[PDB]
């Protein structure tokens, strides 16, 4: 084998992505799911939507959207989640992010720990 050759110029095509600051999320004694408002995400292919689930985090990318691209990643989750079990969904002008609950019957005071920590600055940290 081993055979190929080509070279063409490529103009300014996409690249940058929007940062999803405001995003709705909810948790229930069973599983975790997030709901973001993205008009067009229900029109874009699953190829433009790249999301990866982890043990305590989850990344979600969104390219080619409403005349732009959006990105959403969460690092440090109050509680762990099941990747294999974790799944992603897309609703009308909305993106769903099903995150399996590593342990059911649990409450999430905050999507992530960061918020918590910050939120709870002067508290019973030690002990």
UniProtKB/Swiss-Prot annotation:
Modification type N6-acetyllysine: residues: 30, 63
Effect on the protein of changing residue 9 to N: Abolishes interaction with SIAH1
Key word Cell division present: no
Mutagenesis or variant effect for residue 11 to N: Abolishes interaction with SIAH1
Single GO MF descriptor: protein domain specific binding
Role noted for this protein: May be involved in calcium-dependent ubiquitination and subsequent proteasomal degradation of target proteins. Probably serves as a molecular bridge in ubiquitin E3 complexes. Participates in the ubiquitin-mediated degradation of beta-catenin (CTNNB1).
Entry annotated with the keyword Hydrolase: no
Protein name: Calcyclin-binding protein
Record-annotated CS domain positions: 18-112
Subunit comment: Homodimer. Interacts with proteins of the S100 family S100A1, S100A6, S100B, S100P and S100A12 in a calcium-dependent manner. Component of some large E3 complex at least composed of UBE2D1, SIAH1, CACYBP/SIP, SKP1, APC and TBL1X. Interacts directly with SIAH1, SIAH2 and SKP1.
Native source species: Homo sapiens
Entry PTM: Phosphorylated on serine residues. Phosphorylated upon induction by RA or at high calcium concentrations.
Protein origin, superkingdom: Eukaryota
Compartments in which it is found: Nucleus; Cytoplasm
A single GO BP: cellular response to calcium ion
Annotated segments matching region Interaction with SKP1: 18-121
Keywords recorded for this protein, A-Z: Acetylation, Cytoplasm, Nucleus, Phosphoprotein, Ubl conjugation pathway
GO cellular component, one term: nuclear envelope lumen
